């Protein structure tokens, strides 16, 4: 009679919360999507094995067009679950699915999980200092998205950090890397020239958060653009003016150039 | 030789991730702190029972002044776990502890869990639209802090949502309610008079995030400043201009007045 939105976490199946595991385990039907993000440490099997249920994986289409046709009806007479990577409501449109559940007479519940949005705290950057967020999207045809560039600008003026979610094309199995993102940013700089993103801008890269050996790096674009951060998923962060402790961490932990320690108050 | 920072999640003892509960059980020693926050939906006893390890609670002084004399020494020759509410390293000072671990030649790994920063997505407000964050502190003595007001000013000005943490006297186990926070904001408005927070201002209140039955309420200050949002802690959110999808979710899910569909979009 109820629908459960359950996050699976950052990297592998275990990143699910105890609450989530016990709820899934006792659900009649189990659905899930793997297009809003990439969990690089698991497979559908492990998930099924860990949960003890078969999972019917839905596509973006199935969801954005037929959620209320494929999943809701079932919830009407059973306890159904819908699994997603990270937290199910962060940087997605799944929140709107809840309204569909309401309009279908189905009560829904959200079981949170660790999200990349807060996991970036491992970069040593103060979470409260992050400003507006944005996504570096793959250009399509002659359409070249640029707004994410303005966000960085607007935040930096206020001294706020910018969190840049990198694009993903699950079906095409395309996962944007920090490098490609840095590449697109540089090209946007040329056609705007706002002195916002250049070879001397400081950036921070976080790859595969949730894994025990994630890639945490900070430095100048020039020195990082061609660097290997390992397999996806990747996220890019353009920090604002740093606090001494943030810099001390970036250097001591992310291998940033000791010269960022000498902050220009 | 290994120090494990494990997040306990948001509300009860079931909010810890499966990876966290396993790494915790296999540790030799287990520390925890409940000064940055409390798990209002559980107890130290229930967490101890779930992990099967006695837990030593450290104070804000035990950590900020003697982390290296209390926890790291044991981490040199054993597997030690440091448990904290929410997601590790989100609390602005916990990051430098990893630096202390590095300095002591100790290995450290961060085991994530749900944070209030990502969990607030249950309000239906888009995550990327959150700006700088802040804490509403109680005035006291001759000290009357008001920055959180300006934070709201700069975010709403750029159409960004402001996440407001409410003061907590962790030790005395005393919380600031959402109602109290509003009353304080009105007084700040009444003094600075910047057209930021008034009776007509729209706010969102989140309580007990992480439990299956969170309180999600949205509406105008004048109709919510005296409303009963249940037990603490409470999170207050002052939204910026809303996306129609956001407003609809606040109406359909958080019981907000239809008036917001024409006044706040
Ligand atoms: N474990 C991880 N490590 C690094 N980046 C990650 C990540 N998980 C997600 N991301 C980033 O966020 C994008 C997916 S956005 C969807 C996020 C999800 N709801 C959550 O709560 O995490 C990815 O393309 C990537 O840029």
From Swiss-Prot, chains A, B:
Name its GO BP terms in alphabetical order: methylation; protein histidyl modification to diphthamide
In its UniProt record, a GO molecular function of this protein is:
diphthine synthase activity
Which domain of life, per UniProt? Archaea
The record's annotation in Pfam families points to: TP_methylase
Q: Known EC number(s)?
A: 2.1.1.98
Per UniProt, S-adenosyl-L-methionine binds at 10, 87, 90, 115-116, 166, 209, 234
| UniProt keyword annotation of S-adenosyl-L-methionine present | yes
Describe which pathway this protein belongs to, using the record's wording: Protein modification; peptidyl-diphthamide biosynthesis
Keyword Transferase on entry: yes
**Known catalysed reaction(s)?**
2-[(3S)-amino-3-carboxypropyl]-L-histidyl-[translation elongation factor 2] + 3 S-adenosyl-L-methionine = diphthine-[translation elongation factor 2] + 3 S-adenosyl-L-homocysteine + 3 H(+)
Keywords assigned: Methyltransferase, S-adenosyl-L-methionine, Transferase
Q: Name the job this protein performs.
A: S-adenosyl-L-methionine-dependent methyltransferase that catalyzes the trimethylation of the amino group of the modified target histidine residue in translation elongation factor 2 (EF-2), to form an intermediate called diphthine. The three successive methylation reactions represent the second step of diphthamide biosynthesis.
- Could you give the subunit structure recorded for this chain? Homodimer.
This chain belongs to the protein called Diphthine synthase
């Amino acid at each position: 009679m109820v629908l459960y939105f359950i996050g699976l976490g950052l990297y592998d199946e275990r990143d699910i919360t105890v609450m989530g595991l016990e709820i899934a385990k006792k659900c009649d039907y189990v659905f899930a999507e793997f297009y809003t993000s990439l969990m690089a440490g698991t497979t559908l099997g492990r998930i099924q094995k860990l949960i003890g249920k078969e999972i019917r994986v839905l596509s973006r289409e199935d969801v954005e067009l037929n959620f209320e046709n494929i999943v809701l009806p079932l919830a009407k007479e059973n306890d159904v679950a819908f699994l997603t990577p990270g937290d199910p409501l962060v940087a997605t449109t799944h929140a709107e699915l809840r309204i569909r559940a309401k309009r279908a007479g189905v009560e829904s519940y959200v079981i949170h999980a660790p999200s990349i949005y807060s996991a970036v705290g491992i970069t040593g950057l103060h979470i409260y200092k992050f400003g507006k967020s944005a996504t570096v999207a793959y250009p399509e045809g002659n359409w070249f998205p640029t707004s994410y560039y303005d966000v960085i600008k607007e935040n930096a003026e206020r001294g706020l950090h910018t969190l840049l979610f990198l694009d993903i094309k699950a079906e095409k199995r395309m996962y944007m890397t920090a490098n490609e993102a840095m590449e697109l940013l540089l090209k946007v700089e040329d056609m705007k020239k706002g002195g916002v993103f250049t070879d001397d801008t400081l950036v921070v890269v976080l790859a595969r958060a949730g894994s025990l050996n994630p890639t945490i790096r900070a430095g100048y674009v020039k020195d990082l653009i061609r660097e290997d951060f390992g397999d996806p998923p990747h996220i890019l962060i353009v920090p604002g003016k740093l606090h001494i402790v943030e810099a001390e961490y970036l250097v001591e932990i992310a291998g940033a150039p000791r010269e960022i320690l000498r902050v220009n108050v």
